[PDB]
Symmetry: none
């Protein structure tokens, strides 16, 4: 057998909600179902021709057997359509797309929906280890699952924000550099929102509660009228002696994203329109303490697999979990800053952990289309000391 | 670019612990680290040549960021080695192997460790989102994660055991048929244990508490099981039903892993391929009938391999419930003598995220012991899926 | 030895907060300390002459050893002053005062502060004993203490509201009758508030939070938007086929009340001014299913012990936990509706369960003073099938 | 009106269970029902001539509306019989009896069942009170109700055991003194058990569970073959440099006790046999840090009210919550050790907090009968810095 080509046929995302914000009552699985259905619709594929659904999701606690399969079922897909759920932390949503592409390239499937989903506002709490056998006597604890499974380092026991401080120190990324980057992200996001740059990529969500009904269609994390002065006055969020603040880090957020990926000859034979070819993908490992540098080896490997140099890439989405690591990555790889996050990034837009990797890919494709660019790179760091990267080529 | 062949170079598992038994103080991730390291050792690969680690794990709650990655680091692999955690419920451990094989076949890696790990004893209890945003007024619930994320159907809200009842009714699988099958499994497992048939595949685990001892023998098998004792058991899930604790698997702890490699690269390194992965597939069925998942998965796997079922010499078909084991057999036409020759999960246990890899490890060793050529490993998956893999001994 | 006379020397309450409202950050014990201190101040007694403090409190869970004793200490009383906490559910605050009177009449004390305190907003949630001995396998429940220890029948396992439906059916109290009564309570309460009728009896509470700093002095439960039409449009709260709604029942509420009670000769010898003599008190029992009828036997007995007929009473406070039971009691006893709850009742004002019995007594005495009336009756029903009543005579 | 005389007509208790022991599946309320019914049977009163039931209960969390009233109903008393629940912490069970005597002396009742009940094994756990509005973000705690509501000082936030260390220091009570006292209590209890001395006072409890079925009739907390050597080897429980251990302090325990109390001339006219007259009672306050000294002012007051000197008392039950405080109280008052806790005390027998004050009164009465003594004193310390005492005259 010879390897096949894989293409993207559609790409969609929800608007990203704030913590306890507009999506705080909409399960991760319902957000996933929303983007799966929308990606199917927008691709104009026959929904009975979907071979698998692969979805990232990090905070799986309490969500029930295999969130990806629940989401595909809730989307309306037939019971015969398989799926599974991927946890590579912040990389989960892009890893899902990379696995879809691999399955297609390998001849194992022709059509897959892939992406990620996360609702952090609805993450649960855990009882301490004594609950099953009995607390007996004495107080106990309850553990926040966001922190335990999502935002704390399992190797070192400190917050991802501390890994960001480590990177800041190791690569000489100052508080002022981090705040300038943040303000840049805020400004680009505001301009993208105001110009309608995200209109094409966002599927609205109807939100119904006892109190109110409303349609959520605009990213709500951005901080209007951000200024260098307001940023410089914030206190550090993770260490009193540190540099990382709520203003130069992304947030806790809720959202989902998905893409239809298909074997190229099959998409063409079905009369569909390939939007981009997936050219390469790769993952990389680094020390957990320096997890924010994950994108460096992932990107190097991806570019090598694509037969490209970094300069060949027209547009880059590099996730902004923390300004500190965003900057250190860019400095190490030599990113042309004018090509990166042209519509703003996670500091403004948010970081729904299991969706973000797919979210950035969605934003990347649509930005390449708007600017008629040919080659794009999406990459992000991963808690536990990893990175993932993907290169796509517009058609 | 051309597709590559993938081979198994080693295969190992822990003994399977009972609920609150010998492995109940050993974290899933530590069990995973054990089997990763052992699989690497047994393969005689250079451990710096591992490209990725892929591990199944279902009850992820409270285990911390990306359990597979923690397990690979705890095994001693370098920080440059990537990994990720797979959740396809009961299929997770076999799915991980299938993903490893695929990555190899696709030229994206040369050497992967894959498998699965589960400690159901250590699964936590959970307060739902209301603990975070406020209960406000009125009662809430505290959820056993074993049930919520492992053993209850997310679509129907009832136990996997109820899906087994559905299957028993739909396919005419009686209580007596279920109990006969359970006794057979108990007998075969006891004979396998007694003859040393699991000795080659099991990596012992050192357990330290309190208690210091070595765990090396599967402890879920029920000594002196009888048709009479089984026939008297009360149904476990429905008072008018057929499924009991004696004709269903348990809640269990364990792990399993295999070294998978591109075939030319294994040979060039002077290693010994144990089997080639010939095909793999997944299938979807109604969640209410999830125990039937192996049927389409096996059909597809066999078709991908260019084989008929009769070509297969040995089969491992997981026994989550006798009801579904039997219905699956009837729908596929299994030769009962070729299936679960060393016993199955009714006797051995069902550590959910590991079981898919566990059966593969057991299959391969049984094929070696009996000098057989073709083997099939398959299992049902909560939520209405199945997975199957065919391997060919070298 | 001869029995002694007992008099009221002061009577005070907090304004009654709404659930999650103005008092929701002020602990029951701090509310109790506030009224204990104020009652002592208003009585003009030497505070070293207080022999005991007796406080009603129903939701004791998590409040620490003997809430009454914590309140007395927080009020500034010496550690030599004893106290204890009474739980007769809704009757607790009146029972505390009855006990104080009895102790004084029996020559066991000369001066006692009695009342009740409740913060329902701050009531905890609970894990039952399986948390201590171990869940083992399978789920458990997390119980709202308001419901478990306050508002659900321990005998029948249903809400107090269902007992109100039972009473509505048994005594033929219709939805319309209930709503007419509710509107009347709302109207009397609004007029009493507006005319200042509660100024003398209320002690203000200072409230400080991160968000707000303010003084709470006006009952906030009353519903300005009350009309027969709005009330008729409400859905039943407890039974879809029933009559009881949020509009014709009291609320979940926060508040406290206290009174200084003294032996009569001693109050006079100290140069203090008795406000009223406690003439009698009694408790009664009825079926838990019909607990709202508790006041009938309690009142009958209290009247007999006072040597009075119901027509001798000038003013009545009969608590309005539910219009259904308020009305059924009144019909049974033959209350002159113009003498009852002249400043409005709990449907408008609220029902902080362990305080309400003392609260109504405070309201009664001040209303008797305003109207120069001689004989008063305070009575209320009690979950679990009881009632309590007290008759007082102005001096 | 003139005061009346109050007599005890019956006195009964359960055996005391160990933590997680024989009574650990029998609710406090069911234990209370068992002693209420037995006390009524033993008194030979018409089985419905009860005016009120008054029960002590400290850990009321999650037990439902007014545990005393649930207990009286479960005992089979008619719904017309009133009841309430008392919380004066460790003093609750004796406080209930005192209140019953006061109501009778006051002419307000003729026949009351009073006592206390506690099941510490079944005490629940509490979520942080913020769970109602939400933990929001970050780890939290779960609180043991035994500790929060029973065993920790609400004023100082430390364990009753620490108050015991405070008293040991203040009054010079050494580890060796404490251990000698403990061994003495163990020995007396073992001899009392072996001689049948508790047989008359104990009501057996049938325990039926899925696992086990048996009759519980013998106190199970006593430690068989206690020695000075085993005691001297124990580690301190509450402070590493301290004196208080599991061997010289009481336990966490389950149990209940109740008495029928009646007006004297009416008991006689009914043909009943008074067992003792309640001669006096009182409560006292001390610093919470020194709560174990509570019995001193309570006992001084009770004796003064009875017109007696300490030396007139024939037998004393002084609770042994901690040897340290037991001894300090005895030294301060000058107790004749030969007259105190003649059948052993709580170090051997256990301390079911809301029951103990009634429990010791039951033991005192039966011991007076066995030794044909005339005057008895029952007293105990109370968390929060109180004490209570009662003097009885045989019968």
């Amino acid at each position: 057998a010879s390897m096949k080509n894989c293409v993207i046929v559609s790409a969609v995302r929800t608007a990203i909600g704030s913590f306890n914000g507009s999506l705080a009552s909409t399960s991760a699985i319902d957000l996933g179902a929303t983007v799966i259905k929308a990606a199917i619709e927008r691709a104009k594929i026959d929904s009975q021709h979907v071979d698998e659904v692969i979805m990232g999701n990090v905070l799986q606690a309490g969500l029930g057997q295999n969130p990806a399969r629940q989401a595909l079922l809730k989307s309306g897909l037939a019971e015969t359509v398989c799926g599974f759920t991927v946890n590579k932390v912040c990389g989960s949503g892009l890893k899902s797309v990379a696995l879809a592409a691999q399955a297609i390239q390998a001849g194992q499937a022709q059509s897959i929906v892939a992406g990620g989903m996360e609702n952090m506002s609805l993450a649960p709490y855990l009882l301490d280890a004594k609950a099953r056998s009995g607390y007996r006597l004495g107080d106990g604890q309850v553990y926040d699952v966001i922190l335990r499974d999502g935002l704390m380092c399992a190797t070192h026991g400190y917050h991802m924000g501390i890994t960001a401080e480590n990177v800041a120190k190791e690569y000489g990324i100052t508080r002022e550099m981090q705040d300038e980057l943040a303000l840049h992200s805020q400004r680009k996001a505001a301009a993208a929102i105001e110009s309608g740059a995200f209109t094409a990529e966002i599927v609205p969500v109807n939100v119904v509660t006892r109190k109110k009904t409303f349609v959520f269609s605009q990213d709500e994390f951005p901080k209007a009228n951000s200024t260098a002065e307001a940023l410089g006055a914030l206190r550090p969020a993770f260490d009193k002696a540190g540099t990382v603040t709520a203003g130069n880090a992304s947030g806790i957020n809720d959202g989902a994203a998905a893409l239809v990926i298909m074997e190229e000859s099959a998409a063409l034979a079905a009369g569909l329109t390939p939007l981009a070819r997936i050219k390469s993908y790769a993952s990389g490992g680094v020390p957990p303490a320096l997890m924010g540098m994950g994108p460096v080896p992932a990107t190097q490997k991806a570019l090598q697999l694509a037969g490209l140099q970094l300069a060949d890439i027209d547009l880059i989405e590099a996730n902004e979990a923390f300004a500190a690591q965003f900057l250190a990555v860019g400095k190490n790889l030599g990113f042309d800053s004018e090509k990166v996050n042209v519509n703003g990034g996670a500091i403004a837009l948010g970081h729904p952990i299991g969706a973000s990797g797919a979210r950035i890919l969605v934003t990347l494709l649509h930005a390449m289309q708007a600017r008629d660019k040919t080659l794009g790179l999406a990459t992000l760091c991963i808690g536990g000391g990893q990175g993932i990267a993907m290169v796509i080529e517009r058609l």
